[PDB]
Every structure is written in structure tokens, then in C-alpha cells.
From a paper:
BV associates non-covalently to each SFP monomer in a ZZZssa conformation and is stabilized by aromatic stacking, hydrophobic interactions, and water-mediated H-bonding inside the lipocalin-like beta-barrel fold of SFP. The binding of BV induces tetramerization of SFP via interaction between amino acid residues from adjacent monomeric subunits. Using a combination of designed site-directed mutations, X-ray crystallography, UV/VIS, and resonance Raman spectroscopy, we have identified multiple conformations of BV that are stabilized in the binding pocket of SFP.
The V71E and L135E mutations showed an order of magnitude reduction, with fluorescence quantum yields of 0.003 and 0.0025, respectively (for excitation at 630 nm). Measured torsion angles were 122° and 125° (counter-clockwise) for V71E and L135E, respectively. The conformation of BV is ZZZsss in the variants compared to ZZZssa in wild-type SFP. However, the atoms of the D-ring of the L135E have larger B-factors suggesting that even in the crystal structure, this ring is more flexible. The lower resolution structure of L135E does not allow modeling of structured waters replacing the rotated residues; however, empty space possibly suggests randomly-oriented or the presence of low occupancy water molecules.
Numbering used by the authors: 22 to 187
The structure:
Amino acid sequence: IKPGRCPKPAVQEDFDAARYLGVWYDIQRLPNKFQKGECATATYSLSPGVGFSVFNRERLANGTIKSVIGSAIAEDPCEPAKLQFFHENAAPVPYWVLSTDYDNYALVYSCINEGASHAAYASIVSRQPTLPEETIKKLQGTMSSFGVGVDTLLTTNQDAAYCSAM
Ligand SMILES: C=CC1=C(C)/C(=C/c2[nH]c(/C=C3N=C(/C=C4\NC(=O)C(C)=C4C=C)C(C)=C\3CCC(=O)O)c(CCC(=O)O)c2C)NC1=O
């Protein structure tokens, strides 16, 4: 969908998927097919392998909320930050944890080589509906350092008015 093939950025070192569990609020995201809504959250829970179970939830414009259940598993237990996201009726897409503090923020990247083009996902997630605008900028610097159009990014709405039932 986007011209050019995938870059290979650096990922989180000594990534602990146990400290990555819990709820993560979406702060910024690259536009895509699937996330056509707001009030988006990801909840990661125990899974037998190297990874976690996935519950992604968002509220749509019409008010009804839509969730997906999935799995994120590391295929190389020695590289815990490079995981694969498996979901019902689809081929797995990558799930790379580029950077995280486990307690406040996380930067996740994903890219699929599509012939001469590529498809990509990117997400700034926080442990609260907001994240300090200074950390957003620092993470946008990392993203732009490897080709990510930080200017195509969409700020997810996490305002109580619209997300008044979560
Ligand atoms: C690297 C980033 C990234 C990947 C690999 C990704 C994968 C991904 N997210 C999806 C849905 C979704 N994904 C999210 C949200 C997230 N999903 C996340 O991985 C993160 C970090 C959030 C934000 C907290 C939500 C809310 C849906 C449901 C979309 C719907 O209602 O159909 C779907 C398919 C939905 C369906 O089957 O209908 C895929 C393949 N999304 C991403 O943003």
C-alpha cells in the first residue's frame, strides 16, 4: 500500500513480556484497515509460550464497540521483542516492541513486505489514556529515524465523553 520495502529497526533489549502485560491505551497509530475507531486499548494476559494473549478493544463511531482476540508469540525465544500476532482467519503479522519502560510507554512496529511496496502498523501506547507530549516527540523521533511518516500519525481519542462506558 506504501511504496518501498520494510526497514529493520532496533527492538527493546532484555524485553520482559511479563512486565508488558496488563492494559495499554492507544495514543497514536498509523492509519489502517482494521482500526476505524477510537477509545482503543490493548490488554495482554498470560500465555503458555513466549508472549501473551491479546484483547484489542475500540469504540466505533456508531457507539457500538468491537473487539478482536489474538495471540502474540516470539518465534525466537532469544529475541523476545520480535513477536508474531496471530488472529482468527488471517496470516500472522509481525509485532515488534521497539522501546518500552513497562510502566508508562511502549513503541510497537510492524511491517509486511508487499512486492515493491509495504504495509505497516505503528503504535504509541501508554498505561493511561494520555502520555506526556514530550515522550510522544521522543518516540516520534525514533519512528522518523527509520522511515515512519510521523506526519501520517493519528492521535486516538481517549476522552471520557466519547469513551463513556469503558
Ligand atoms: C504494531 C502495531 C499493530 C499491529 C501488529 C496490529 C494488528 C491488528 N490489529 C487488529 C485490530 C485491532 N487492533 C486494535 C488496537 C491495537 N492493536 C495493537 O497491536 C496495539 C498496540 C493497539 C492499541 C492499543 C484494536 C482496538 C482492534 C480492533 C479493530 C476492529 O474493531 O476491527 C487486526 C485485525 C482486526 C480484525 O481481525 O478484525 C490486526 C491484524 N495493530 C497494530 O496497531
